[PDB]
Amino acid sequence: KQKALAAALGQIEKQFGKGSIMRLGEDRSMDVETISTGSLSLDIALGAGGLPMGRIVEIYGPESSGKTTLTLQVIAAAQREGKTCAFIDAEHALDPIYARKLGVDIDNLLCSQPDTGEQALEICDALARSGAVDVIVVDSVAALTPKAEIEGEIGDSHMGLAARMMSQAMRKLAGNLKQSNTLLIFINQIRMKIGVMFGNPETTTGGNALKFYASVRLDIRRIGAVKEGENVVGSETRVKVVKNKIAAPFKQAEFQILYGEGINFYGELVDLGVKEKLIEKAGAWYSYKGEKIGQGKANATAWLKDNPETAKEIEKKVRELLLSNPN
Ligand SMILES: [Mg+2]
């Protein structure tokens, strides 16, 4: 029933919204402004090219999973486009040196270290309503301690309280964020071993409000080392888009996060370029449009870095080629 399907689906989307259902292989994505994640493969996995403005995103992972790099890259990206970013901190772990290396303009990064998780939430909401901040990164859900636990009343349970606190703010936050067309990223981790666990064993802190309100949920984890010699220079990273309401979910990205430098964007370009046959890897040389760009992924990368113009041309056809847009 191909036609009946379409009507059915259309019917369903009419009733529940666009993308309330879709074929995972479909080249559909919401027409949302987006900010790059810094990863080309992730921007692609996201389908729409980046994280969606006005939506709530959740990026969870272990410590040193790369979630920090990602969020920093996002801010960095956002700021490059002239967007105002706010960092709602409860983690107190911001590394401005590293952030600067990733291109975050720390000086202009709005920052806040709230007195309670509720206050943090209310500040996010406030910012949301203002429509003056474009990106809000909340670090992190697990660190957002409910005022009551802070006061020792901790009782009710921690899980209970946190979930309640999150559930109380989500709906409004989501709505205001949408109006101001403000992106709010919640950094989370998989909840503490009680439970046992259980359930899901991979359940993150905070309850279900975020789980269900998020337009995008990224499962990021370090899957290995990047070694230039016997010396480790970075983490081999895997980001799974476990939830995607702006394009089909479940696609994943793999890329390297190099210590001090950040995501290895050009490494990706090379790989995606090769995969999409834009880049030739045969013979003794990698080439683009028939010209030599380098010997081995390593040089190819470097080259792309020293030829941003060509690198941009490739990123562009890769996006045309891989982003989930109607074509
Ligand atoms: Mg060749």
Numbering used by the authors: 6 to 332
Sentences from the paper on this structure:
In all organisms, this is catalyzed in an adenosine triphosphate (ATP)-dependent manner by the RecA-family recombinases, including bacterial RecA and eukaryotic Rad51 and Dmc1, among which Escherichia coli (E. coli) RecA has been most thoroughly studied for decades ((5,6); see for reviews). The primary single-stranded DNA binding activates the ATP hydrolysis activity of RecA, as well as the ability to bind to double-stranded DNA in a sequence homology-independent manner (secondary DNA binding). RecA, consisting of 352 amino-acid residues, contains three domains: an N-terminal domain, a central core domain and a C-terminal domain. The central domain has two flexible loops, L1 (Gly-157 to Met-164) and L2 (Ile-195 or Gln-194 to Thr-209), which could not be modeled in the free RecA crystal structure determined by Steitz's group.
We solved the crystal structure of an inactive DNA-free form of RecA, in which we were able to trace both loops L1 and L2. The RecA helical filaments in the crystals had six protomers per turn, with a 72.1-Å helical pitch, suggesting that this crystallographic filament reflects an inactive state. The core and the C-terminal domains in each protomer of the inactive DNA-free RecA and those of the activated RecA–DNA complexes superimposed well (root-mean-square deviation of 1.03 Å for Cαs of residues 45–156, 165–194 and 210–328), but the orientations of the N-terminal domains and the conformations of loops L1 and L2 significantly differed. Unlike a number of previously reported crystals of RecA in the absence of DNA, our inactive RecA crystal provided an electron density map for most of both loops L1 and L2. While loop L1 in the inactive RecA is unfolded, in the activated RecA–DNA complexes it forms a short helix (αL1) followed by a turn and an extended segment. Asp-161 lies at the tip of loop L1. In the structure of free E. coli RecA, Asp-161 is located at a position where it would not obstruct single-stranded DNA binding. On the other hand, the spatial location of Asp-161 in the free RecA causes steric clash with and electrostatic repulsion to a complementary DNA strand that was located in the structure of the RecA-double-stranded DNA complex. Thus, the flexible loop L1 appears to cause a steric barrier to a complementary DNA strand. Our study revealed that RecA actively selects single-stranded DNA for the primary DNA binding and that Asp-161 in loop L1 plays a crucial role in this mechanism.
